[PDB]
């Protein structure tokens, strides 16, 4: 929440955002073989989330 | 490359795309503690890439 650092926080905001739509759309009726298979797609938000947690430490003051 | 399935291929196209800009921007001057730390961000394209490979099998005809 400084001024230029917080700008990086928003960057990750879109990463998890697109994952929401791309998720419901992905299985919207294109191809389904296994649950774990598609799980790799949602994992994108899982990883970015882990770092997104500490990313706030250097960005804002939790 | 069917008609509706290929639509899912483009979805992943943006995932790896944003990762390109968000990468150079992330380290544009916001915070740097460790290499592996930021590596978690680029990993997003690594995972989506793995599935993006086979995703073409059910989509188009490689």
Taken in order A11, A38, B42, B15, the sign of the CA dihedral is: negative
Task: Establish how many alpha carbons lie within 13 A of residue B8's alpha carbon, considering only the half-sphere containing its beta carbon.
Answer: 26
Residue B30's alpha-carbon distances to A28, A39, B51, B61, in angstroms, are 37, 31, 31, 43
* Nearest Cα to Cα of residue A25 among B29, B48, B10, B60: B10
Q: Residue A11, Cβ neighbours under 10 Å: how many?
A: 20
Q: Is A31–B4 a contact, with Cβ atoms under 8 angstroms apart?
A: no
The end-to-end CA distance of chain A, in Å, is 10
Q: Is B48–A59 a contact, with Cβ atoms under 8 angstroms apart?
A: no
| Under 8 Å between Cβ of A8 and B34 | no
Q: Classify domain B1-62 by CATH architecture.
A: Helix non-globular (6.10)
| Under 8 Å between Cβ of B26 and B41 | yes
With a CB cutoff of 8 Å and minimum separation 6, the contacts of A51 are: A12, B37, B38, B40, B41
Nearest Cβ partner of B18 from A14, A38, A50? A14
Q: Which long-range contacts (CB under 8 A, 24 or more apart) does A25-34 make?
A: A25/B8, A25/B11, A26/B8, A26/B11, A29/B4, A30/B4, A30/B5, A30/B7, A30/B8, A30/B58, A30/B59, A31/B5, A31/B8, A31/B55, A31/B58, A31/B59, A33/B58
Q: Is B14–A14 a contact, with Cβ atoms under 8 angstroms apart?
A: no
> What is the rounded CA–CA span in Å between residue B51 and residue A36?
11
């Amino acid at each position: 929440m400084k001024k230029l650092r917080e700008e990086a926080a928003k960057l990750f905001e879109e990463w998890k955002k697109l994952a929401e739509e791309a998720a419901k759309l992905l299985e919207g009726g294109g191809g389904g073989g296994g649950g774990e298979l598609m799980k790799l797609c949602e994992e994108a938000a899982k990883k970015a989330e882990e770092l997104f947690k500490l990313a706030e430490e250097r960005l804002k003051k939790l």
